[PDB]
Amino acid sequence: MEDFVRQCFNPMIVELAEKAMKEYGEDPKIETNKFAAICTHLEVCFMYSDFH
Amino acid sequence: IKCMKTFFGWKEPNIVKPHEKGINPNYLLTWKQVLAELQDIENEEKIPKTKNMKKTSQLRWALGENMAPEKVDFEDCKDVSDLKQYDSDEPESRSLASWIQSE
Amino acid sequence: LLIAQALRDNLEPGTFDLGGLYEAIEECLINDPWVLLNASWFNSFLAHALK
Amino acid sequence: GTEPIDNVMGMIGILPDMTPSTEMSLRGVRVSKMGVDEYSSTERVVVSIDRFLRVRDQRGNVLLS
Amino acid sequence: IEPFLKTTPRPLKLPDGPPCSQRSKFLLMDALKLSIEDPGEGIPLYDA
Amino acid sequence: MATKADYTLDEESRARIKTRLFTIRQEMATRGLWDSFRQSERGEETIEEKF
Amino acid sequence: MDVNPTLLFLKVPVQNAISTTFPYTGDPPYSGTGYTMDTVNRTHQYSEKGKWTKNTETGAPQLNPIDGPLPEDNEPSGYAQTDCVLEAMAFLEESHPGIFENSCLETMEIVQQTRVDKLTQGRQTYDWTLNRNQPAATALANTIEIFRSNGLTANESGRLIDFLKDVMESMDKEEMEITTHGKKKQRLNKKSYLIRALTLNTPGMQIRGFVYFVETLARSICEKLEQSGLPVGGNEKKAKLANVVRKMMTNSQDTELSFTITGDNTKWNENQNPRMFLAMITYITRNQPEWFRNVLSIAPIMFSNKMARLGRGYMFESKSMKLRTQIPAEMLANIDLKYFNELTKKKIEKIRPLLIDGTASLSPGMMMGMFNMLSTVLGVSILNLGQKRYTKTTYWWDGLQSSDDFALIVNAPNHEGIQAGVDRFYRTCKLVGINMSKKKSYINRTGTFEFTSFFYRYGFVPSFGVSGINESADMSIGVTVIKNNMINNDLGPATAQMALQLFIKDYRYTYRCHRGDTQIQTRRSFELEKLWEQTRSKAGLLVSDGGPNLYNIRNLHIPEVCLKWELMDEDYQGRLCNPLNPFVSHKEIESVNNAVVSMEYDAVATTHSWIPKRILEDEQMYQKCCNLFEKFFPSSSYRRPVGISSMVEAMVSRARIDARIDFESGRIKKEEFAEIMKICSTIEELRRP
Amino acid sequence: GVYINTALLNASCAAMDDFQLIPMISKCRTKEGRRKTNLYGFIIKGRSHLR
Amino acid sequence: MERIKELRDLMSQSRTREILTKTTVDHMAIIKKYTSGRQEKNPALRMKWMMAMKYPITADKRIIEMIPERNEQGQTLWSKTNDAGSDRVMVSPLAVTWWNRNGPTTSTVHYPKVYKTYFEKVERLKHGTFGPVHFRNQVKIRRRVDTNPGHADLSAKEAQDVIMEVVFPNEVGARILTSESQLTITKEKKEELQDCKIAPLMVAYMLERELVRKTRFLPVAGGTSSVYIEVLHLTQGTCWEQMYTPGGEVRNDDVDQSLIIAARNIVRRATVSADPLASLLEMCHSTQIGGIRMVDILRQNPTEEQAVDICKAAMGLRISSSFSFGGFTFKRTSGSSVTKEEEVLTGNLQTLKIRVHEGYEEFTMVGQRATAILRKATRRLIQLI
Amino acid sequence: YVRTNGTSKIKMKWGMEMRRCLLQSLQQIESMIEAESSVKEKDMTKEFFEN
Amino acid sequence: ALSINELSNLAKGEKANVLIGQGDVVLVMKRKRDSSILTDSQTATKRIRM
């Protein structure tokens, strides 16, 4: 899973999610479903705001 | 090198006429290695004044060094049925062509 | 045979239990002509190699 | 320096002049005949990267400065 | 580790009892052979 | 879906995100991961695999 | 002269003529409950001084030797120590930093991405549904059907771990109702189901999952270690031997005395206690997600409660009436023993207490396979407790291990040092649980040794014929083998040509493909004869047809059809390579050039690519549905389809679309179009409920 | 051996329930060069319903 | 029209409707693996047994209309038995030769290009050159080398996207249509295989066999090329070397060196910047090597060079644990180490700071023209072979 | 010499491989020839089989 | 619904529903503007990284 998370999502959103988990003390590796959920949420948010 | 810097139309080499009884790929790769070696001379400081080419399979085969027959004493190769006097008969007659006249 | 050949090379072969190995070899020689002939061949080889 | 070799199984020694020698060879350097086999795996891993293009690892040994 | 010297090997003790009897499918050496110089149809019963 | 059936974007820009969500679903299903990811959702919290 | 071939070794070293010491070139033609009883009894005799408990769930008497009294003789023993195994694993981790942690992650990706079909890939497996051996795929199908009937359907996610959740949920069900198709339904008590679940055979479908994760973790660990040659084959094991020998026998000084201990471990599968494997997985998976320790530590838990099944039984015969019964193994527990012989008397008397409803209670042992690779890790643990750091003395040892095959080297400064090193290694192995075999191990100075049939002497030193799948898929498999062995296993040129000649003889005698000119009479003769007259160029004919050979050595890799292409006739090319053959048949990318023999061979799909001839209610239900879907979506046979619609919805959508584009093209004769659309409407209605 | 086993296999498959008479033929190539055929004996197969 | 009837009758019985409705298209390949039967142990014996009886080989129920039941001598070519359960009628091998002799001809122009990966071997051996056999004691290292010349340097996953677009245009997925990577090979093959009637599945298999690379870890003793390893059985032996030369065509490994150069430039200009990560990622996602986006190349090639290694690592890709020094890559087999920068004095009494690698470790020092094994302790070259 | 023996399919296919036995013999001889050829740096086939 | 082939006959913005892949039918439309993942995506992500 985490390998796919790194593969598709760019390092920027990856690091944003990294700090997001760190704010709540969540391991980026023990938790991976939440990692992918946060990456998807951030990317959809940015793609929503962008190009406007 | 100062001459080959005068030409900017180098393309990817392509075999347009094979030897038809020889080693085509290693003729191609010897050229693709000459280009690389000339590039390396450019990157180095000062001209070596003599560039010994890396001894690779391509050069060995193109040069024929890997095709030449090995010398064997007659005692060993007595049974081999293909032994024959060298140049036993090969005066293959070939007719005149115009290219020599044009030359 | 491998132990014997190792001895023939002066490699100083050892063993942890040889009686067990001999019993293992002899447990399979019962009533087979070919097996018994091979055993006789092996005995002759031992007699002629190590001596 | 150079130290003696006992000619174990056939292993030509290398002299400081980069020449063969069946008795005298460099320290800890034993040129091997019959070839030395390579490996069949690479052990791919993920390695942390510092901010200065130095690829350290989770163990802390630089791999490619 | 016990040493293995040239005096260590012992002849294998082959078994004892009645002599062994042959058990192959077909006779090996005591086999007669009725021959024919057929240059045959490739048929078994023909040549038999 | 959205509140009051209002979508505050042009159609082409509401498409450029649905397209990527669909592509992520496909690429995460061809790797056998989609099924696990789906069941990881409860309410709005993403529970973790438990055995 | 009485010819004695073995005397040939008086001139050629044994290793240089070891071929003649292997009698059989293939599989010998030759080949019971007594053996099972013997293996069950001997395991309990090796653990006599162990706790005798009574499992409260399965109700079986179990024997626990772990942390038992230390052995007091060279006899085999399994009184292994938890402290020693844990210390050995800890020292292994220190030598190879971050091996367990790094390998666990590589197993995390496989414990989640794996589907439920990995339980079909394998060999015959015991089927708890019917108490009968039965293929892997069909056993999985039966298990899934029974679970669905019982209401345990979480395996519908397609994930193996969900199937494991289902089996563990079943393990708590009060009753498991099995429906057999007469239509008779039988209910198993919780206990009765448990024993039928924790049962080996002469291991159920409920253990293939956990023992797959444990085995893949072990494989991941073993790949990293260079002292383990089990997760490799051929050329790989031929490099580790050379590297280790060249490392140890190149002593920096003449003081070191090298010595190799070629040998094996006796009863290697009767002393490896499962409790010991649980006690090294709880160490390997340290500081890992708690869900990753409850999935890799189940098989060791289950293997220590296993109830091995005795088998068939013994047959009783009377010399007067010449009768023959079978005495099924179940009734052995409650039977009068006057019938049996003396040896069987003793065996059955010894094993009688361990029986529970005709099932053994082989707790203190581990059957063949089943962590064949974790035991290799255990063995390499003690090949690692010799690195000159954990010995603290002059002697140090290395070597390899391949699951009861080690080549330990004992470098030391003098003979007493070598003896001390060998003794210490033996004692450490005995503590850990490994019992070396002193009747098959011989120590000799380094330079020559043996490792699982690899005979090393200053240098290293059954697959010929028709495989029997097709006619073009054998002239490729055989020629490919003749070069695989000629590249890997040192098969020389002349032997290669001889093997090719004999292979073609077997080919022509099995497929009746003798040349047209020769006059061997067979069913196919006449046809070939005619085909031998029409052709103008005869070199082009395939060996499968009446035709010559052209494979010498320089084209053992070229597939035949591409070899005889310039030499083939156009009127022959057309018929041979005609895509509209009624013979060519291939319905999966799996077998589109892949024979179990799994081998990768080259073929050109000619008319010779034919295929030979050969609880659920309808065993073909899944096959029917998948074949129909393949019909609707042709690329279902190449790439695993991905989508969100159900199978029916996709199929009906494509059926509607194809018809519309067809009637719009005039190839469907509208009356048919309306019928197809109304049929689709009917099917869609049937889906509403 | 190979000829006898091949012939007996073909007979076993062809006629399951007939005591077919299988000769024991072999074929040489005499030192002169002329082919020669040889009969060693006769074999009478039994009921060969091999499952 | 018949397939929809089949689906309707499958759905009629309310036991396969569950399987046909609740199994998403995703869970079809895991249903496809619930096969029946016991396969067959000892297949060679079964073949030798089958060919003894008549009608061994099954064929679809079409021979009946294109193969007479008897040839011109009265031998039953095919029977009517319906092997096991199927429509496949049993057939004697005489039918195969009857088809090959009195059968429907055809034009085979799509075969020499669909099966390019074999005719290439044929035309490469047909022009090979042979040299004298040298019986020198051969030394055979165990190199891991490519065994698929002309693999078109595609991975095992984008090859699938090429197949689905050349052989199955009407089953392409979202990840392809909603993209902008058409590739060049997918436009050549689509043109070549424009009317092929061969075997869609077989065409796919051949394409994925041609468009993938593989390695084998073989005992090589020279050459090491992608073409010299198919003829390994002919060139080298346990005691002989038959000098040989394939006479086909080679691959130009220029994309890899171009990638190396681009990675070097990008890493320099990103580390000389304020935020290296942003520059690296933007350049990778924006820079293109010969048209292709550099991200695709990085996710496609296996090239192992320092600059490319850093470029991949900054993109969160697995990188080989081996470290490359002086042109040789050092795979650790055992031991642990710590950098521990310490101070020393050189020969000229010059101060120096070097990472004293503290810890005993063993390395395999594999290289282009040499190999070695080196085990060393802290400031202790224990052994080097 | 009349006797009543018995055979099975496995034994039949086993007896149809004495040509594999031929292969094993040639393999051993060729191994010896190759070893000597490597030692003496030439081909000893003729020397072995004619001297 | 259409087939992946018939989608060749659409304008630069016309919307049609097609049978994508093995099964499901999804409404589809041609794209206006390149719509790639170049620096534009980075800007939204790197700007927040300040």
UniProtKB/TrEMBL annotation, chain A:
Q: Where are the transmembrane segments?
A: none
Q: How does it assemble?
A: Influenza RNA polymerase is composed of three subunits: PB1, PB2 and PA. Interacts (via C-terminus) with PB1 (via N-terminus).
Q: Which family does it belong to?
A: Belongs to the influenza viruses PA family.
According to UniProt, the name of this protein is Polymerase acidic protein
Q: State the taxonomy lineage.
A: Viruses, Riboviria, Orthornavirae, Negarnaviricota, Polyploviricotina
The gene behind this protein is PA
UniProtKB/TrEMBL annotation, chain C:
Tell me the superkingdom of the source.
Answer: Viruses
Residues of the signal peptide: none
What does the sequence similarity comment in the record state about its family? Belongs to the influenza viruses PA family.
Q: How does it assemble?
A: Influenza RNA polymerase is composed of three subunits: PB1, PB2 and PA. Interacts (via C-terminus) with PB1 (via N-terminus).
Protein's name according to its UniProt entry:
Polymerase acidic protein
Species of origin: Influenza A virus (A/turkey/Turkey/1/2005(H5N1))
Residue numbers of the full-length protein present here: 663 to 713 of 713
UniProtKB/TrEMBL annotation, chain G:
Its GO biological process annotations read: symbiont-mediated suppression of host gene expression; symbiont-mediated suppression of host mRNA transcription via inhibition of RNA polymerase II activity; viral RNA genome replication; viral transcription
Region called Disordered, residue ranges: 47-79
Catalytic activity, reaction form: RNA(n) + a ribonucleoside 5'-triphosphate = RNA(n+1) + diphosphate
Molecular function terms, GO-annotated:
nucleotide binding; RNA binding; RNA-directed RNA polymerase activity
Q: Which GO terms describe its cellular component?
A: host cell cytoplasm; host cell nucleus
Recorded hits in Gene3D superfamilies, A to Z, give: 6.10.140.720
EC numbers for this chain: 2.7.7.48
Function noted in UniProt: RNA-dependent RNA polymerase which is responsible for replication and transcription of virus RNA segments. The transcription of viral mRNAs occurs by a unique mechanism called cap-snatching. 5' methylated caps of cellular mRNAs are cleaved after 10-13 nucleotides by PA. In turn, these short capped RNAs are used as primers by PB1 for transcription of viral mRNAs. During virus replication, PB1 initiates RNA synthesis and copy vRNA into complementary RNA (cRNA) which in turn serves as a template for the production of more vRNAs.
Protein name per the record: RNA-directed RNA polymerase catalytic subunit
Q: Which organism is it from?
A: Influenza A virus (A/turkey/Turkey/1/2005(H5N1))
